[PDB]
Amino acid sequence: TDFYTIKDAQADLAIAPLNLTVLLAPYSTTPATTLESPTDGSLAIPPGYKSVGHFEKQAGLTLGNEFDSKDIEAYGEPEPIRTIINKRTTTFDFAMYQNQRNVLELIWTQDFSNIQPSEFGGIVLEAPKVPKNIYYRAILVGMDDRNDRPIWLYWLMPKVKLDKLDNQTLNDDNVIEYKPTLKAFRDDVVGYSVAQGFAGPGWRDLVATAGFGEALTALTITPGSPTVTVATGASHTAQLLVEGDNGINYTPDVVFTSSAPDKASVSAAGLVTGVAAGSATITATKGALTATATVTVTA
Amino acid sequence: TDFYTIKDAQADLAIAPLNLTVLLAPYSTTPATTLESPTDGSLAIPPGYKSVGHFEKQAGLTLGNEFDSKDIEAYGEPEPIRTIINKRTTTFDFAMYQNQRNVLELIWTQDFSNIQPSEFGGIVLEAPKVPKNIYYRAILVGMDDRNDRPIWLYWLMPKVKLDKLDNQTLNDDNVIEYKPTLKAFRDDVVGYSVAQGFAGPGWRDLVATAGFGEALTALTITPGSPTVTVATGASHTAQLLVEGDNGINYTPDVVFTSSAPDKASVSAAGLVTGVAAGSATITATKGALTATATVTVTA
Amino acid sequence: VVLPDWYEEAFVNVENLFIDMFTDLLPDYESGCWAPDDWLADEIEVKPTIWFFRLPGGRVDWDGRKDECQLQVMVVTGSRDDSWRLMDFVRAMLLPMQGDKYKMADGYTAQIRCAGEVAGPQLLTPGQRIDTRVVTATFKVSVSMKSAKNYKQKLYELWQALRG
Amino acid sequence: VVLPDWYEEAFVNVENLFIDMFTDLLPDYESGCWAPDDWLADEIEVKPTIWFFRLPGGRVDWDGRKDECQLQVMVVTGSRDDSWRLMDFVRAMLLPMQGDKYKMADGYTAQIRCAGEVAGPQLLTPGQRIDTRVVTATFKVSVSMKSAKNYKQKLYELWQALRG
Amino acid sequence: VVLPDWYEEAFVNVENLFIDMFTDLLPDYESGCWAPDDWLADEIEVKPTIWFFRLPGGRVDWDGRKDECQLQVMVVTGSRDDSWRLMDFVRAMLLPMQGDKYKMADGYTAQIRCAGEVAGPQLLTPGQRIDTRVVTATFKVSVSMKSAKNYKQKLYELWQALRG
């Protein structure tokens, strides 16, 4: 039969991160549960997230999720029954090129806030007398682009600290390489340690294909018969919002066509201003689904 | 003498799997003892078997069957007498490209059913507070094609769980690689842990050559003297079924030739409708064996 | 055609597979493994043609029922954009081939295992042909064998009959 | 243009991306992948031109949605200093390219992953052209794929319709 | 000279560095990277000249602010002993170069990191030129970059202005 269908080798939603900008924040900064702003559809970050800089290009980041389990058997069983798992530590190591405030703070485990540059620029980076176990907020967001709607993926973690610093070579063939591995810890005020998040306008196109939620099969414009005043009044302009069967907005991607531009014209932004009093029909399609809406315009 | 005969180097039934589509099912799904539908001869799977996606092409799956034994000797014996074996764990690791529901569920050991995509597509993959040892149903079926009759082989296993997750590299030279190894466990309601199964119409050709059962040396059409009505009645059409000495049907492959098409004509499907009343002779051959059947047609 | 009857065939002739499947896909544009005189008659306007020429590279194992060859893809047409889009179509029809079947007019249906890539497209400079645009690329195509049974027996009895 | 409708495109044609982006950046200086007759008409004074010719090197994986090619950069002009500064500008615009987008007139916007370097500048000796100064460099440019969906289905139904 | 103002320069042009520093060291003996007609006018008696021609070899990393090239040293003069002593002087001035600064007439001062050696002296046979003695050697010279800031921004706003 059609074994390719049951294979389900889509080979289209396999996103590959490109810009692994590792955001660092102090412990005082409140961690954010999402990397997307629920007001427009773009990316927003709370204040305090400062990028580490540029990471290794030829090698890149090597994230490792070590698993440690245990077997229990005391009554003569050929196989381990109830195989429990104890440790699920996640470690990742990335190289560094630039020497800025956050990088030195992370590599020396200090708070270089009271330090001040001298009158001639002379500075000293002091190792602590007692090594403080300062915790940091780490954000590991990747990038993938599909036309004008990219794919945003990130490795959310609200607690991380130094685990081991590898030996660095500062010879005359490469720049100084700071590649310390960090083991992710578990936070208490939020209840999660490592989180995988997908965002971006492009992810909306393939969220149904990925199997999350339900498939997009129905759509309807929420304003049934909106009324807009011809004059520049309070209700002169109106905003449309089409809702699908998956409970996700489809405004920024689905375009709206006004069959009667004389009465009211709707652009891609979904604005409903109205040119002349009357009734108009608006059709919204993206690539396969057609939805019809009726807009009434009066003075 | 003829040492090639005693070598028995057939070199023809050595099948190589091509499409290693790993089917994943939840624990609630009832495992199936076979991957073939005993009604037509094609492949059928019970609902709940969802393909993981696409696996690594350059490396592929590396299944390992580790064996652990023990030796007993207490009376001064030069060799270990009664060498018992204790562990026969089977482990297999395969890489993954796509990021869909089943892959994320397997890699994070959670049940992302209560989760719902946000109004802007924002989602979070939450690691469990306590790592649940959720078990999965795994089907590892391969593919090999010989003319129009392919060869189906599968690695049936009704219990599997995560064993270890290897470190993944997400640098700018390849897509994210999820290659976790899974150790097969032993199921209780069915009594088997790992099963090897061969199916497909092509396997019928070489099942005798493989030594399973007995060699195909006899054949006979089960309907001796079938009677078909000329008019469109209840018994207007009849279905033939030739049975060999191995107790296996040979209908889809053996072709039937009607020596008297005026009375009754039999196609490759074995249909017996009858054109005119009388007696007809049908000969069934595949490549070496000839079987004769007599069909009586009357109004 | 005086080959012995006990031997039918050994391999699949994967280039014949490819030329036949491309001709069947788009009969309007001819494809083959030679240079027909009719095509060479007109050069300012040329019917787009796909050429497959066998190149060395890749081992073979009779035991594993696996064969591979570095078959190259060469496309010639009257426009660079047309050549590039035809090469893109060929690459889309060849690279994502993992266990795919296709039947020949001989009777057997071949099985393509994997079609790799060795060298990228080559925009060869116009030499003998000036107006025509040619792009050359090499593919690592692996195909299965039709019949892998050994012919030790018949050779042995022929030797015994001839000398003993 | 008689390609099947169910197939739209496979790859990006990264050299078209590069020539279009360079023409858009500085429209005064023309750039392309050929040798126009108008440019060859005058040789003592030549408009600086950037040429991109595809060269072999680099694998490709359909599963990973990654493509790479050893596209070379060749600049020709009437002064050695002008060629050197143009090559420096090209390297400044190409080497620091890590996840960068640019849109074509076709409609899709390409994504350049990483543009490496293989061979340094090549001040070729003046052969057929004497006054013009030419510098050749090779770049390892990796680009993403537009659509990576497989076309097994349509080929299978076409085969079934043709033979069965 | 119609290059955009927001871009100043990318690389150092290390061969210009070397020719300028050699001309400044000994102004009596001219050095360069070309073949002036005045020098070619007289061949029985030739002013000793040092020629630097860029050759392939060596990678480059923008993140590390490191650049390298296999720049070769070719010396031509009227005596074998003079050529040998000039090559020895060049090697004395080049091999022990570890973090050395030198300023150009443009305004910036370059930084030579390390000048390696690949191939030894090559006493080329007298071909077109008979009386002149020529010795060829190749050096692996690594130089730092002037400015390594990325130009993603301006390209992005130019793209946004052109299309959106």
Side-chain angles (χ1 to χ4, degrees), chain C residues 103-130:
Chain C
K103 175 181 170 76
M104 286 292 99
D106 303 328
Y108 196 80
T109 184
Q111 164 61 280
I112 284 297
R113 203 186 323 280
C114 55
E117 187 261 338
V118 192
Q122 288 311 107
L123 188 62
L124 270 75
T125 77
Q128 215 279 331
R129 304 299 218 84
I130 296 90

PDB file of all heavy atoms in Angstrom, chain C residues 103-130:
ATOM      1  N   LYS C 103       8.551   0.659 -12.131  1.00  0.00           N
ATOM      2  CA  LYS C 103       8.519  -0.504 -13.006  1.00  0.00           C
ATOM      3  C   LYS C 103       8.969  -0.137 -14.415  1.00  0.00           C
ATOM      4  O   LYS C 103       8.613   0.923 -14.938  1.00  0.00           O
ATOM      5  CB  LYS C 103       7.113  -1.107 -13.047  1.00  0.00           C
ATOM      6  CG  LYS C 103       6.943  -2.259 -14.023  1.00  0.00           C
ATOM      7  CD  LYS C 103       5.515  -2.779 -14.012  1.00  0.00           C
ATOM      8  CE  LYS C 103       5.270  -3.749 -15.153  1.00  0.00           C
ATOM      9  NZ  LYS C 103       5.881  -5.079 -14.880  1.00  0.00           N
ATOM     10  N   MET C 104       9.758  -1.021 -15.019  1.00  0.00           N
ATOM     11  CA  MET C 104      10.234  -0.857 -16.383  1.00  0.00           C
ATOM     12  C   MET C 104       9.337  -1.612 -17.363  1.00  0.00           C
ATOM     13  O   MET C 104       8.491  -2.422 -16.978  1.00  0.00           O
ATOM     14  CB  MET C 104      11.680  -1.341 -16.498  1.00  0.00           C
ATOM     15  CG  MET C 104      12.710  -0.405 -15.880  1.00  0.00           C
ATOM     16  SD  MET C 104      12.876   1.152 -16.776  1.00  0.00           S
ATOM     17  CE  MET C 104      11.872   2.243 -15.775  1.00  0.00           C
ATOM     18  N   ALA C 105       9.536  -1.335 -18.655  1.00  0.00           N
ATOM     19  CA  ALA C 105       8.792  -2.047 -19.688  1.00  0.00           C
ATOM     20  C   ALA C 105       9.242  -3.495 -19.826  1.00  0.00           C
ATOM     21  O   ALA C 105       8.540  -4.290 -20.461  1.00  0.00           O
ATOM     22  CB  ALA C 105       8.932  -1.327 -21.029  1.00  0.00           C
ATOM     23  N   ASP C 106      10.395  -3.850 -19.255  1.00  0.00           N
ATOM     24  CA  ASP C 106      10.846  -5.236 -19.293  1.00  0.00           C
ATOM     25  C   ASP C 106       9.949  -6.143 -18.461  1.00  0.00           C
ATOM     26  O   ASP C 106       9.720  -7.298 -18.836  1.00  0.00           O
ATOM     27  CB  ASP C 106      12.293  -5.330 -18.810  1.00  0.00           C
ATOM     28  CG  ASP C 106      13.238  -4.466 -19.624  1.00  0.00           C
ATOM     29  OD1 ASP C 106      12.994  -4.294 -20.838  1.00  0.00           O
ATOM     30  OD2 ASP C 106      14.229  -3.965 -19.052  1.00  0.00           O
ATOM     31  N   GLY C 107       9.436  -5.645 -17.337  1.00  0.00           N
ATOM     32  CA  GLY C 107       8.550  -6.428 -16.498  1.00  0.00           C
ATOM     33  C   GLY C 107       8.839  -6.305 -15.016  1.00  0.00           C
ATOM     34  O   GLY C 107       7.923  -6.376 -14.191  1.00  0.00           O
ATOM     35  N   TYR C 108      10.107  -6.120 -14.663  1.00  0.00           N
ATOM     36  CA  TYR C 108      10.516  -5.990 -13.273  1.00  0.00           C
ATOM     37  C   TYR C 108      10.414  -4.539 -12.820  1.00  0.00           C
ATOM     38  O   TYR C 108      10.560  -3.607 -13.616  1.00  0.00           O
ATOM     39  CB  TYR C 108      11.948  -6.492 -13.085  1.00  0.00           C
ATOM     40  CG  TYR C 108      12.327  -6.758 -11.647  1.00  0.00           C
ATOM     41  CD1 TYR C 108      11.936  -7.928 -11.008  1.00  0.00           C
ATOM     42  CD2 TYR C 108      13.071  -5.835 -10.924  1.00  0.00           C
ATOM     43  CE1 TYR C 108      12.281  -8.173  -9.693  1.00  0.00           C
ATOM     44  CE2 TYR C 108      13.422  -6.073  -9.609  1.00  0.00           C
ATOM     45  CZ  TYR C 108      13.022  -7.242  -8.998  1.00  0.00           C
ATOM     46  OH  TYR C 108      13.368  -7.480  -7.688  1.00  0.00           O
ATOM     47  N   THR C 109      10.162  -4.354 -11.525  1.00  0.00           N
ATOM     48  CA  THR C 109      10.102  -3.029 -10.920  1.00  0.00           C
ATOM     49  C   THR C 109      11.322  -2.841 -10.023  1.00  0.00           C
ATOM     50  O   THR C 109      11.573  -3.650  -9.120  1.00  0.00           O
ATOM     51  CB  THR C 109       8.790  -2.827 -10.152  1.00  0.00           C
ATOM     52  OG1 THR C 109       8.721  -1.489  -9.641  1.00  0.00           O
ATOM     53  CG2 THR C 109       8.621  -3.827  -9.016  1.00  0.00           C
ATOM     54  N   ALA C 110      12.092  -1.792 -10.293  1.00  0.00           N
ATOM     55  CA  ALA C 110      13.329  -1.553  -9.573  1.00  0.00           C
ATOM     56  C   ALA C 110      13.056  -0.902  -8.219  1.00  0.00           C
ATOM     57  O   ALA C 110      11.976  -0.367  -7.959  1.00  0.00           O
ATOM     58  CB  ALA C 110      14.267  -0.675 -10.393  1.00  0.00           C
ATOM     59  N   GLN C 111      14.065  -0.955  -7.353  1.00  0.00           N
ATOM     60  CA  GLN C 111      13.984  -0.391  -6.011  1.00  0.00           C
ATOM     61  C   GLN C 111      15.187   0.517  -5.791  1.00  0.00           C
ATOM     62  O   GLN C 111      16.321   0.039  -5.692  1.00  0.00           O
ATOM     63  CB  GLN C 111      13.928  -1.495  -4.954  1.00  0.00           C
ATOM     64  CG  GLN C 111      14.220  -1.030  -3.538  1.00  0.00           C
ATOM     65  CD  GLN C 111      13.227   0.002  -3.042  1.00  0.00           C
ATOM     66  OE1 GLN C 111      13.324   1.185  -3.369  1.00  0.00           O
ATOM     67  NE2 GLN C 111      12.261  -0.442  -2.249  1.00  0.00           N
ATOM     68  N   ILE C 112      14.941   1.823  -5.721  1.00  0.00           N
ATOM     69  CA  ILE C 112      15.991   2.803  -5.467  1.00  0.00           C
ATOM     70  C   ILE C 112      16.147   2.950  -3.959  1.00  0.00           C
ATOM     71  O   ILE C 112      15.186   3.278  -3.255  1.00  0.00           O
ATOM     72  CB  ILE C 112      15.664   4.153  -6.124  1.00  0.00           C
ATOM     73  CG1 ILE C 112      15.920   4.089  -7.630  1.00  0.00           C
ATOM     74  CG2 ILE C 112      16.484   5.270  -5.491  1.00  0.00           C
ATOM     75  CD1 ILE C 112      17.367   3.846  -7.991  1.00  0.00           C
ATOM     76  N   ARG C 113      17.360   2.706  -3.460  1.00  0.00           N
ATOM     77  CA  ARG C 113      17.591   2.757  -2.020  1.00  0.00           C
ATOM     78  C   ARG C 113      17.872   4.182  -1.555  1.00  0.00           C
ATOM     79  O   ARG C 113      17.138   4.731  -0.727  1.00  0.00           O
ATOM     80  CB  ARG C 113      18.747   1.827  -1.644  1.00  0.00           C
ATOM     81  CG  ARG C 113      18.729   1.373  -0.196  1.00  0.00           C
ATOM     82  CD  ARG C 113      19.974   0.573   0.145  1.00  0.00           C
ATOM     83  NE  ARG C 113      20.396  -0.281  -0.960  1.00  0.00           N
ATOM     84  CZ  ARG C 113      19.853  -1.457  -1.248  1.00  0.00           C
ATOM     85  NH1 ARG C 113      18.857  -1.954  -0.532  1.00  0.00           N
ATOM     86  NH2 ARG C 113      20.323  -2.154  -2.278  1.00  0.00           N
ATOM     87  N   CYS C 114      18.929   4.796  -2.082  1.00  0.00           N
ATOM     88  CA  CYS C 114      19.280   6.158  -1.702  1.00  0.00           C
ATOM     89  C   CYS C 114      20.087   6.789  -2.825  1.00  0.00           C
ATOM     90  O   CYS C 114      20.970   6.143  -3.395  1.00  0.00           O
ATOM     91  CB  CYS C 114      20.074   6.182  -0.391  1.00  0.00           C
ATOM     92  SG  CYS C 114      21.566   5.160  -0.394  1.00  0.00           S
ATOM     93  N   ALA C 115      19.780   8.044  -3.141  1.00  0.00           N
ATOM     94  CA  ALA C 115      20.486   8.805  -4.167  1.00  0.00           C
ATOM     95  C   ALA C 115      21.218   9.951  -3.477  1.00  0.00           C
ATOM     96  O   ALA C 115      20.609  10.965  -3.124  1.00  0.00           O
ATOM     97  CB  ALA C 115      19.522   9.314  -5.234  1.00  0.00           C
ATOM     98  N   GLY C 116      22.524   9.787  -3.289  1.00  0.00           N
ATOM     99  CA  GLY C 116      23.335  10.792  -2.641  1.00  0.00           C
ATOM    100  C   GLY C 116      23.788  11.876  -3.601  1.00  0.00           C
ATOM    101  O   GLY C 116      23.388  11.937  -4.766  1.00  0.00           O
ATOM    102  N   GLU C 117      24.646  12.752  -3.086  1.00  0.00           N
ATOM    103  CA  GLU C 117      25.187  13.860  -3.858  1.00  0.00           C
ATOM    104  C   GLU C 117      26.674  13.988  -3.567  1.00  0.00           C
ATOM    105  O   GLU C 117      27.081  13.999  -2.402  1.00  0.00           O
ATOM    106  CB  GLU C 117      24.463  15.170  -3.527  1.00  0.00           C
ATOM    107  CG  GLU C 117      24.856  16.348  -4.400  1.00  0.00           C
ATOM    108  CD  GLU C 117      25.874  17.251  -3.731  1.00  0.00           C
ATOM    109  OE1 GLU C 117      25.973  17.218  -2.487  1.00  0.00           O
ATOM    110  OE2 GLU C 117      26.572  17.997  -4.448  1.00  0.00           O
ATOM    111  N   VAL C 118      27.477  14.084  -4.625  1.00  0.00           N
ATOM    112  CA  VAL C 118      28.931  14.187  -4.512  1.00  0.00           C
ATOM    113  C   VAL C 118      29.412  15.593  -4.858  1.00  0.00           C
ATOM    114  O   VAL C 118      30.040  16.264  -4.036  1.00  0.00           O
ATOM    115  CB  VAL C 118      29.634  13.124  -5.386  1.00  0.00           C
ATOM    116  CG1 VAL C 118      31.114  13.050  -5.043  1.00  0.00           C
ATOM    117  CG2 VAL C 118      28.968  11.767  -5.209  1.00  0.00           C
ATOM    118  N   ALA C 119      29.126  16.057  -6.071  1.00  0.00           N
ATOM    119  CA  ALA C 119      29.532  17.377  -6.526  1.00  0.00           C
ATOM    120  C   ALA C 119      28.306  18.188  -6.918  1.00  0.00           C
ATOM    121  O   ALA C 119      27.321  17.649  -7.432  1.00  0.00           O
ATOM    122  CB  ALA C 119      30.499  17.285  -7.713  1.00  0.00           C
ATOM    123  N   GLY C 120      28.376  19.495  -6.671  1.00  0.00           N
ATOM    124  CA  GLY C 120      27.275  20.377  -6.975  1.00  0.00           C
ATOM    125  C   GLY C 120      27.159  20.658  -8.455  1.00  0.00           C
ATOM    126  O   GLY C 120      27.902  20.124  -9.292  1.00  0.00           O
ATOM    127  N   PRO C 121      26.194  21.507  -8.803  1.00  0.00           N
ATOM    128  CA  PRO C 121      25.993  21.853 -10.217  1.00  0.00           C
ATOM    129  C   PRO C 121      27.217  22.546 -10.793  1.00  0.00           C
ATOM    130  O   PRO C 121      27.875  23.347 -10.126  1.00  0.00           O
ATOM    131  CB  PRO C 121      24.775  22.785 -10.190  1.00  0.00           C
ATOM    132  CG  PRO C 121      24.163  22.618  -8.832  1.00  0.00           C
ATOM    133  CD  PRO C 121      25.273  22.232  -7.915  1.00  0.00           C
ATOM    134  N   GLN C 122      27.516  22.235 -12.052  1.00  0.00           N
ATOM    135  CA  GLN C 122      28.683  22.768 -12.747  1.00  0.00           C
ATOM    136  C   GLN C 122      28.216  23.487 -14.005  1.00  0.00           C
ATOM    137  O   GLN C 122      27.798  22.842 -14.975  1.00  0.00           O
ATOM    138  CB  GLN C 122      29.673  21.656 -13.093  1.00  0.00           C
ATOM    139  CG  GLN C 122      30.424  21.103 -11.897  1.00  0.00           C
ATOM    140  CD  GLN C 122      31.027  22.195 -11.043  1.00  0.00           C
ATOM    141  OE1 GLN C 122      30.546  22.477  -9.946  1.00  0.00           O
ATOM    142  NE2 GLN C 122      32.084  22.824 -11.546  1.00  0.00           N
ATOM    143  N   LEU C 123      28.287  24.814 -13.992  1.00  0.00           N
ATOM    144  CA  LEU C 123      27.945  25.621 -15.161  1.00  0.00           C
ATOM    145  C   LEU C 123      29.146  25.616 -16.097  1.00  0.00           C
ATOM    146  O   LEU C 123      29.993  26.512 -16.067  1.00  0.00           O
ATOM    147  CB  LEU C 123      27.553  27.033 -14.751  1.00  0.00           C
ATOM    148  CG  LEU C 123      26.995  27.933 -15.857  1.00  0.00           C
ATOM    149  CD1 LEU C 123      25.710  27.350 -16.424  1.00  0.00           C
ATOM    150  CD2 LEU C 123      26.767  29.344 -15.338  1.00  0.00           C
ATOM    151  N   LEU C 124      29.225  24.583 -16.934  1.00  0.00           N
ATOM    152  CA  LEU C 124      30.350  24.445 -17.850  1.00  0.00           C
ATOM    153  C   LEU C 124      30.374  25.591 -18.853  1.00  0.00           C
ATOM    154  O   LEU C 124      29.330  26.045 -19.331  1.00  0.00           O
ATOM    155  CB  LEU C 124      30.276  23.105 -18.585  1.00  0.00           C
ATOM    156  CG  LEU C 124      30.963  21.906 -17.932  1.00  0.00           C
ATOM    157  CD1 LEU C 124      30.160  21.394 -16.747  1.00  0.00           C
ATOM    158  CD2 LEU C 124      31.187  20.798 -18.949  1.00  0.00           C
ATOM    159  N   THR C 125      31.577  26.061 -19.164  1.00  0.00           N
ATOM    160  CA  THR C 125      31.726  27.142 -20.126  1.00  0.00           C
ATOM    161  C   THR C 125      31.310  26.666 -21.516  1.00  0.00           C
ATOM    162  O   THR C 125      31.552  25.510 -21.877  1.00  0.00           O
ATOM    163  CB  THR C 125      33.171  27.638 -20.157  1.00  0.00           C
ATOM    164  OG1 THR C 125      33.980  26.711 -20.892  1.00  0.00           O
ATOM    165  CG2 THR C 125      33.719  27.767 -18.743  1.00  0.00           C
ATOM    166  N   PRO C 126      30.681  27.529 -22.317  1.00  0.00           N
ATOM    167  CA  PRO C 126      30.284  27.118 -23.671  1.00  0.00           C
ATOM    168  C   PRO C 126      31.482  26.899 -24.580  1.00  0.00           C
ATOM    169  O   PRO C 126      32.187  27.848 -24.939  1.00  0.00           O
ATOM    170  CB  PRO C 126      29.415  28.286 -24.153  1.00  0.00           C
ATOM    171  CG  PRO C 126      29.861  29.455 -23.341  1.00  0.00           C
ATOM    172  CD  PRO C 126      30.256  28.904 -22.003  1.00  0.00           C
ATOM    173  N   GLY C 127      31.720  25.645 -24.954  1.00  0.00           N
ATOM    174  CA  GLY C 127      32.831  25.304 -25.821  1.00  0.00           C
ATOM    175  C   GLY C 127      32.395  25.059 -27.250  1.00  0.00           C
ATOM    176  O   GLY C 127      32.197  26.008 -28.017  1.00  0.00           O
ATOM    177  N   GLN C 128      32.251  23.785 -27.620  1.00  0.00           N
ATOM    178  CA  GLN C 128      31.766  23.453 -28.957  1.00  0.00           C
ATOM    179  C   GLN C 128      30.358  23.993 -29.178  1.00  0.00           C
ATOM    180  O   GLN C 128      30.042  24.501 -30.260  1.00  0.00           O
ATOM    181  CB  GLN C 128      31.805  21.939 -29.165  1.00  0.00           C
ATOM    182  CG  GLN C 128      32.145  21.514 -30.584  1.00  0.00           C
ATOM    183  CD  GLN C 128      30.951  21.577 -31.514  1.00  0.00           C
ATOM    184  OE1 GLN C 128      29.807  21.421 -31.085  1.00  0.00           O
ATOM    185  NE2 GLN C 128      31.211  21.808 -32.795  1.00  0.00           N
ATOM    186  N   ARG C 129      29.503  23.895 -28.165  1.00  0.00           N
ATOM    187  CA  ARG C 129      28.163  24.463 -28.204  1.00  0.00           C
ATOM    188  C   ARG C 129      28.154  25.769 -27.420  1.00  0.00           C
ATOM    189  O   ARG C 129      28.541  25.796 -26.247  1.00  0.00           O
ATOM    190  CB  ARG C 129      27.137  23.487 -27.626  1.00  0.00           C
ATOM    191  CG  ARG C 129      27.132  22.123 -28.296  1.00  0.00           C
ATOM    192  CD  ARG C 129      26.798  22.239 -29.773  1.00  0.00           C
ATOM    193  NE  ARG C 129      25.953  21.142 -30.230  1.00  0.00           N
ATOM    194  CZ  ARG C 129      24.632  21.112 -30.109  1.00  0.00           C
ATOM    195  NH1 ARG C 129      23.968  22.106 -29.542  1.00  0.00           N
ATOM    196  NH2 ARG C 129      23.962  20.059 -30.569  1.00  0.00           N
ATOM    197  N   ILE C 130      27.715  26.842 -28.068  1.00  0.00           N
ATOM    198  CA  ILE C 130      27.765  28.182 -27.491  1.00  0.00           C
ATOM    199  C   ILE C 130      26.417  28.600 -26.919  1.00  0.00           C
ATOM    200  O   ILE C 130      26.321  28.977 -25.751  1.00  0.00           O
ATOM    201  CB  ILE C 130      28.266  29.203 -28.537  1.00  0.00           C
ATOM    202  CG1 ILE C 130      29.707  28.894 -28.962  1.00  0.00           C
ATOM    203  CG2 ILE C 130      28.161  30.620 -27.994  1.00  0.00           C
ATOM    204  CD1 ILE C 130      29.826  27.965 -30.157  1.00  0.00           C
TER     205      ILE C 130
END
